[PDB]
Coordinates of C-alpha atoms and ligand atoms in Angstrom, one line a residue:
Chain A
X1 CA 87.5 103.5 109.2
X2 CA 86.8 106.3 106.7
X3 CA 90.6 105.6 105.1
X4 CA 89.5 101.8 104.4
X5 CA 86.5 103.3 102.8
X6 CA 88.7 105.4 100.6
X7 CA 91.4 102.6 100.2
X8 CA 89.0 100.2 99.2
X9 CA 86.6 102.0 96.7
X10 CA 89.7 103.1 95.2
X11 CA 90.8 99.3 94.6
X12 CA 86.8 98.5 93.4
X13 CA 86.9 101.9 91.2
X14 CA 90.3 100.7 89.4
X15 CA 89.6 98.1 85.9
X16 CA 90.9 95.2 85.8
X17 CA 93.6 96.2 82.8
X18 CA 94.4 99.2 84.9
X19 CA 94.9 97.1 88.7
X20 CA 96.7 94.2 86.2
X21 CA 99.4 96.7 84.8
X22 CA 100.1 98.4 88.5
X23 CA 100.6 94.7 90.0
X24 CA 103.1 94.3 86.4
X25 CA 105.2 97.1 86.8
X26 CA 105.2 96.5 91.1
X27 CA 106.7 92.7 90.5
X28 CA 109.2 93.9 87.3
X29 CA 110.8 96.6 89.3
X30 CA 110.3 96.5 92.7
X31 CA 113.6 95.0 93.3
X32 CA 115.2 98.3 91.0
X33 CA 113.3 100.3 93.3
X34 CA 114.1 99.1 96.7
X35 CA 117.9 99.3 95.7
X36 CA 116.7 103.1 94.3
X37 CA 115.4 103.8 97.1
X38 CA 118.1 103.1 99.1
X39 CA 120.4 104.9 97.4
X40 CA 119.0 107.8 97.6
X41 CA 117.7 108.1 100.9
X42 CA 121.1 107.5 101.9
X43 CA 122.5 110.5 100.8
X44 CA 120.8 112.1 103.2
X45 CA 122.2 113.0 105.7
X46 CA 118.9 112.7 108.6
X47 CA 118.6 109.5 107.1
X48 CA 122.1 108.0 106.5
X49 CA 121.9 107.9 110.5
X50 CA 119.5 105.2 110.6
X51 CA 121.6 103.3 107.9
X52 CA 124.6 101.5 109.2
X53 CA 125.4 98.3 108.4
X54 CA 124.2 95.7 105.4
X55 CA 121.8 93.6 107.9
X56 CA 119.6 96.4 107.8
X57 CA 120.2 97.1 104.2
X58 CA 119.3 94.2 103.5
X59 CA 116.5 93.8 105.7
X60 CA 114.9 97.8 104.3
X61 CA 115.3 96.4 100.6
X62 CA 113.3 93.1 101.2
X63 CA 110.7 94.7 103.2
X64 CA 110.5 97.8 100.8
X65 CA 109.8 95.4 97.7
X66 CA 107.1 93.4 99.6
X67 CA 105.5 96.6 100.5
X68 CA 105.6 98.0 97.1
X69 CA 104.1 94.9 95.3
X70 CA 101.6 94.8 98.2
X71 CA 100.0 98.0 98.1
X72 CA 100.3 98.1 94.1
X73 CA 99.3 94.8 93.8
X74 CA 96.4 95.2 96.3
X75 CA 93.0 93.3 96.2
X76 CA 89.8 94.2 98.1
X77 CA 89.9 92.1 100.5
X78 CA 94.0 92.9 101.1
X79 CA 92.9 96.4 102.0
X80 CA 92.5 95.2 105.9
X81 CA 95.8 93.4 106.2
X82 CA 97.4 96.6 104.1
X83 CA 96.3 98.9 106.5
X84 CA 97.6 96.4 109.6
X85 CA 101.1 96.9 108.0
X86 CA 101.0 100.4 107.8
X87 CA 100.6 100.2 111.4
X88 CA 103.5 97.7 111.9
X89 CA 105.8 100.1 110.2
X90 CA 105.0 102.7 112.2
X91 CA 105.7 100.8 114.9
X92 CA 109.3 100.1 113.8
X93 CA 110.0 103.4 113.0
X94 CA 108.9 104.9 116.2
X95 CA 110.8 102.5 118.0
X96 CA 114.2 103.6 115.8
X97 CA 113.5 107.0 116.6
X98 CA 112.8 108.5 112.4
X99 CA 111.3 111.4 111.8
X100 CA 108.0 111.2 110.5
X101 CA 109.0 114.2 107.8
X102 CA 112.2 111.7 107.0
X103 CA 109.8 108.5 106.2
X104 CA 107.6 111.3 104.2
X105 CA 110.8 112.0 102.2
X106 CA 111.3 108.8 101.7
X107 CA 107.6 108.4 100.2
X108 CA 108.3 111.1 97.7
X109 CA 111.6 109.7 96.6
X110 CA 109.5 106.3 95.9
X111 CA 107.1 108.3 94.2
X112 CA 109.7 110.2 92.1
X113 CA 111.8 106.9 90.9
X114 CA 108.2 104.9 90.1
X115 CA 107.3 107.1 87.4
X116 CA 110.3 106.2 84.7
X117 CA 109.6 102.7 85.1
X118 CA 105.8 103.4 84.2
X119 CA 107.2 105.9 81.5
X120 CA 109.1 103.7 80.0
X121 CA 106.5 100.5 79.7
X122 CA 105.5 99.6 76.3
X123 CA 101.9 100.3 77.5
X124 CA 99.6 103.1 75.7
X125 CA 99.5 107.3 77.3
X126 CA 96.4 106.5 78.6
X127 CA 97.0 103.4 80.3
X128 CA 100.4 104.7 82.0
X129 CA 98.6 108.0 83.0
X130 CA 95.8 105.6 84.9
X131 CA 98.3 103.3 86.3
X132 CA 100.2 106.2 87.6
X133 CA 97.2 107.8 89.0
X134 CA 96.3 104.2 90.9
X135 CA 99.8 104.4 92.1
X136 CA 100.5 107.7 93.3
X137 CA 96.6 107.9 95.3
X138 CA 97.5 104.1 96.4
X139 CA 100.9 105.2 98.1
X140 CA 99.8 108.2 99.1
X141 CA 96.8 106.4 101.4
X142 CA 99.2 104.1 102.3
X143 CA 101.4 107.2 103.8
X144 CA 98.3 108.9 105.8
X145 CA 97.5 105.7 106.8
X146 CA 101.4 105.0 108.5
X147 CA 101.8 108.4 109.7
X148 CA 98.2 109.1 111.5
X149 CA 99.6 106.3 114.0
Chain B
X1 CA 120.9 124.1 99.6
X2 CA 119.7 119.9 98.6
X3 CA 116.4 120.5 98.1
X4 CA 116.8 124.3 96.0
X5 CA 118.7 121.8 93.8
X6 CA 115.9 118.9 93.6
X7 CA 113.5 121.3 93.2
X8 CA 115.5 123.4 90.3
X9 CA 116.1 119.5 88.5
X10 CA 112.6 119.2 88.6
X11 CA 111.7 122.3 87.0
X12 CA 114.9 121.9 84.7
X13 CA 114.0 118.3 83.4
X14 CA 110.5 118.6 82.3
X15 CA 110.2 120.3 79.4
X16 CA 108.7 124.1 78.3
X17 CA 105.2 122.8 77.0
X18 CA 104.4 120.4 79.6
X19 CA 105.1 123.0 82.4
X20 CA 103.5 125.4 80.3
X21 CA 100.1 123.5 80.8
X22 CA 100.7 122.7 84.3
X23 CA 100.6 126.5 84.4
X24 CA 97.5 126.9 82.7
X25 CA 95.9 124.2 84.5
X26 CA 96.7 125.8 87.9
X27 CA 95.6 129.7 87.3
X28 CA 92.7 128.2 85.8
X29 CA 91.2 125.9 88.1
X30 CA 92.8 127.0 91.0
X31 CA 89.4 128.7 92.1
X32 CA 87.4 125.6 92.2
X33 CA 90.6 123.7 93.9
X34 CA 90.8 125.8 96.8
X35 CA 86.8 125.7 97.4
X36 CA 86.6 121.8 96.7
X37 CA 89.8 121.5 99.2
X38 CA 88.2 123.3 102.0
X39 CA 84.7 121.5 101.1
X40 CA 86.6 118.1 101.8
X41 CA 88.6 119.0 104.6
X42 CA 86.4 119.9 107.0
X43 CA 84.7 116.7 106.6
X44 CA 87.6 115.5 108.7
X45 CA 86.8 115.9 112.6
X46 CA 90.5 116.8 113.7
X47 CA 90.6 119.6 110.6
X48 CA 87.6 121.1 111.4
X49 CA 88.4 122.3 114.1
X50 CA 90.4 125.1 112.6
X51 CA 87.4 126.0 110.2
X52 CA 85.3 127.6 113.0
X53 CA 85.0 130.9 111.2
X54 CA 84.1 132.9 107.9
X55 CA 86.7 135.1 108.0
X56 CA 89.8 131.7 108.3
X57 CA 87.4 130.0 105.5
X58 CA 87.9 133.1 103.5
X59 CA 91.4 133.9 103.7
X60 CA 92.6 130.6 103.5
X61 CA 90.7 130.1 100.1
X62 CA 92.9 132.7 98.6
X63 CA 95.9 131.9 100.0
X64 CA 95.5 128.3 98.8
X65 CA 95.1 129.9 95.4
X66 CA 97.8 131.5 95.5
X67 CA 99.9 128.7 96.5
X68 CA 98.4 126.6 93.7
X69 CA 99.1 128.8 91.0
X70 CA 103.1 129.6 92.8
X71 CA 104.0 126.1 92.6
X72 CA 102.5 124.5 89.6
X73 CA 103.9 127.5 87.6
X74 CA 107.5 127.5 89.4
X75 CA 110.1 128.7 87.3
X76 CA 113.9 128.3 88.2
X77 CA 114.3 131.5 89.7
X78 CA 111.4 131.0 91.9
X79 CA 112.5 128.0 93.5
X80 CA 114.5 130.1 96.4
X81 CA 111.2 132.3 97.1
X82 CA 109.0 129.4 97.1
X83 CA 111.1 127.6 99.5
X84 CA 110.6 130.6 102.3
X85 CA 106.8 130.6 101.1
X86 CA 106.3 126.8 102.4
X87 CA 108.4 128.0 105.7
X88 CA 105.8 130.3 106.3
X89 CA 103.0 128.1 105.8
X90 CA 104.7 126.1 108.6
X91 CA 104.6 129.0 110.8
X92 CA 101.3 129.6 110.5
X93 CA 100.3 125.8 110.7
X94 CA 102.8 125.6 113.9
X95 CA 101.0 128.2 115.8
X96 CA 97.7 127.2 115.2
X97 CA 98.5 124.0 116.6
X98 CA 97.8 121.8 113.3
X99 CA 99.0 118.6 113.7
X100 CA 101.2 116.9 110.5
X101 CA 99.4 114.3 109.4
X102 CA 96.4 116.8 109.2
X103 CA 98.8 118.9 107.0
X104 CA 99.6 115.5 105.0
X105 CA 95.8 114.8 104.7
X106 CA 95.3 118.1 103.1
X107 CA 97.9 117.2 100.6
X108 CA 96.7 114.4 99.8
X109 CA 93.4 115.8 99.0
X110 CA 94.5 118.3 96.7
X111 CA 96.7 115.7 94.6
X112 CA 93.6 113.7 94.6
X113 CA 91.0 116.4 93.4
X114 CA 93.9 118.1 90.7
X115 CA 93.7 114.9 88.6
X116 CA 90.1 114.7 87.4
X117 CA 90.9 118.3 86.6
X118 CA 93.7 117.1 84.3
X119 CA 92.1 114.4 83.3
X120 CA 89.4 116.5 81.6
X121 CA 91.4 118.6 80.0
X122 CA 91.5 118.8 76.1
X123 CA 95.5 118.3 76.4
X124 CA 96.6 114.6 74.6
X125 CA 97.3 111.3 77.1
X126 CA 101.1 111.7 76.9
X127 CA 100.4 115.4 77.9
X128 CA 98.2 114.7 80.6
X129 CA 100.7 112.1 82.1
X130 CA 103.7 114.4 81.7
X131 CA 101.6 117.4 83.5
X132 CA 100.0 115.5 86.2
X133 CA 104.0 113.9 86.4
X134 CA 105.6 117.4 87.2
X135 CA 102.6 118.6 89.4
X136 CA 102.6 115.7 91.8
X137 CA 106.1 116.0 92.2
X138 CA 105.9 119.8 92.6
X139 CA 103.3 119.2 95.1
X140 CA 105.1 116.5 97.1
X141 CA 108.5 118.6 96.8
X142 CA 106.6 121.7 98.6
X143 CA 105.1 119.6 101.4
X144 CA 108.8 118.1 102.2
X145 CA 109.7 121.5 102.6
X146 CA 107.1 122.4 104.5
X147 CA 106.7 119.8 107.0
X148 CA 109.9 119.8 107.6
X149 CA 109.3 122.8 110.2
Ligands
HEM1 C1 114.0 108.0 104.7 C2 113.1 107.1 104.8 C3 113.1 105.7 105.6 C4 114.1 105.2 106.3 C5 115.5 105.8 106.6 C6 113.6 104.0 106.9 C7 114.3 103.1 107.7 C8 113.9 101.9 108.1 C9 114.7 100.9 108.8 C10 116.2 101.1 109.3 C11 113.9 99.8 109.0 C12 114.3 98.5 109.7 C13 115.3 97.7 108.9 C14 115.6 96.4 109.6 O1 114.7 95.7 110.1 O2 116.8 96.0 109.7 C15 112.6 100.1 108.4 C16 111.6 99.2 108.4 C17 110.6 99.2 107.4 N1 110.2 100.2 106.6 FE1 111.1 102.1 106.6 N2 112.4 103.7 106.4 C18 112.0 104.8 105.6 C19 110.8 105.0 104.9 C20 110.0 104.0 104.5 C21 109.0 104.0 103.5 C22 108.7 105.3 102.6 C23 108.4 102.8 103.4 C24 107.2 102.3 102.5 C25 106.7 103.0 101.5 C26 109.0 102.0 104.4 C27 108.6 100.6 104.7 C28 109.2 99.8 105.7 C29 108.9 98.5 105.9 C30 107.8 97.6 105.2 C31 109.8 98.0 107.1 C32 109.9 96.6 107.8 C33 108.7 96.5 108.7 C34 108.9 95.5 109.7 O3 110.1 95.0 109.9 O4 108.0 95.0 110.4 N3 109.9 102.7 105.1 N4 112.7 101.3 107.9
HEM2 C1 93.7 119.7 106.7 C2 94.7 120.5 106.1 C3 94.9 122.0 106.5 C4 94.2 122.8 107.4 C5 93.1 122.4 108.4 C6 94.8 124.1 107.3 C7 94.4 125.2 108.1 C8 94.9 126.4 107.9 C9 94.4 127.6 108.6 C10 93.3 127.6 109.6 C11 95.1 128.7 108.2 C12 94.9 130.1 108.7 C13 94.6 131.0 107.5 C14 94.1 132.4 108.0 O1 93.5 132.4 109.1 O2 94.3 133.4 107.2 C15 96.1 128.2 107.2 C16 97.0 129.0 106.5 C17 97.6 128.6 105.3 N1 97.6 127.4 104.7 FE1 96.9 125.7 105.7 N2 95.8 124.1 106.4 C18 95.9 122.8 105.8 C19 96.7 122.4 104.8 C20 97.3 123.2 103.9 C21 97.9 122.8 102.6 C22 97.9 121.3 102.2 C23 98.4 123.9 102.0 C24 99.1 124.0 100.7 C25 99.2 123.0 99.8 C26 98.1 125.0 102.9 C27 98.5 126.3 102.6 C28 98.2 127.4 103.5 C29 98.7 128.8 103.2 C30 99.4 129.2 101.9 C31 98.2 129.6 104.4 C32 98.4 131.1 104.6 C33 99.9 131.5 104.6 C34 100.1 132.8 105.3 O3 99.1 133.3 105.9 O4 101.2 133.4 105.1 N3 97.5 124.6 104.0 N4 95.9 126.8 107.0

């Protein structure tokens, strides 16, 4: 498909230091930003709905750190099996019944609470501005990818 | 209303010069934006079939300028006008018949093609990071309110 062309030359594009300190700040503070997230969304109210009990707290917070160190963390040849999940999710949140503008929100809360933890790294401006960049293009492909299905 | 207030925080929290350049970058290179968008979006099948015509190519050129330049330069005080502006976007996208994730996709392609703009500005690493910070989050904060329509 013409979004695993994009997905992947954006992973092949991305040097090594650049892909290294993406996957670094993914596994340091994915857990942070899975609770974040939570949070957040939960306030609200078109999304508190679909929030009701600690089974699928817990559930949402595992499954948004795997997703965040996966597509941060992505490889190549993960680009495939990425874009299979995207589909998966879908899936689930069709079946709830969420808005596709409510799991949007929830992409640019993720987007919003991933930049202080880049910030605030000990790397150098140039390093956290390409990181960023990886990040923001890498969940934003990851988005069009879960909402054109 | 919520998002007058997220939007406002945005605005509020980054500071004077790095807005300041968002700004500049914006009015600036809005011009090429808006052609490079349209350039890129009809490439998708499903977009271009609402660029048939001169006169659609044409206007919507401008008004994607204009938008640009509104929210990449949004001051405080705007934030209540800019808010009706995306509403009427959605309007106009409604009764065309353009589906969401096509909206999405053009998002997505203007957050991609504004970064090698920053990127080759003359501004310092820290700046570029800070500027390219506030605008994606602009950006994504407009489309929240926009697609939700
Ligand atoms: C307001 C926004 C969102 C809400 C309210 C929401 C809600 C939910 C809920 C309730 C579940 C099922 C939990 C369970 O199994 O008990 C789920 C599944 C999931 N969501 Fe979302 N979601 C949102 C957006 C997102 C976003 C932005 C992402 C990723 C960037 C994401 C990734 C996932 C994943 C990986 C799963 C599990 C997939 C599976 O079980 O197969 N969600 N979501
Ligand atoms: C694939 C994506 C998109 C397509 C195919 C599309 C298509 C169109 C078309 C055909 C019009 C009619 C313009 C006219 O006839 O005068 C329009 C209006 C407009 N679009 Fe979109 N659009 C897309 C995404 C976007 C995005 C991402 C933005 C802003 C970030 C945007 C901003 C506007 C504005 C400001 C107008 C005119 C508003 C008005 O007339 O009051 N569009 N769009």
């Amino acid at each position: 498909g013409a979004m695993k062309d994009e997905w992947t030359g954006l992973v092949e594009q991305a040097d090594p230091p650049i892909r290294a300190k993406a996957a670094e700040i993914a596994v340091a503070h994915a857990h942070y930003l899975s609770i974040e997230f939570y949070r957040i969304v939960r306030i609200d109210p078109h999304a508190e709905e679909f929030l009701s009990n600690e089974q699928v707290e817990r559930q949402l917070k595992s499954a948004m750190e795997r997703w965040i160190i996966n597509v941060l963390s992505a490889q190549v040849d993960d680009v495939e099996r990425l874009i299979q999940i995207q589909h998966t999710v879908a899936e689930v949140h069709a079946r709830i019944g969420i808005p596709v503008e409510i799991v949007e929100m929830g992409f640019r809360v993720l987007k919003k609470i991933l930049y202080p933890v880049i910030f605030s790294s000990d790397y150098s401006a140039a390093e956290k501005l390409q990181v960023y960049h990886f990040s923001i293009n890498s969940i934003d492909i990851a988005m069009e990818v879960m909402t054109r299905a």
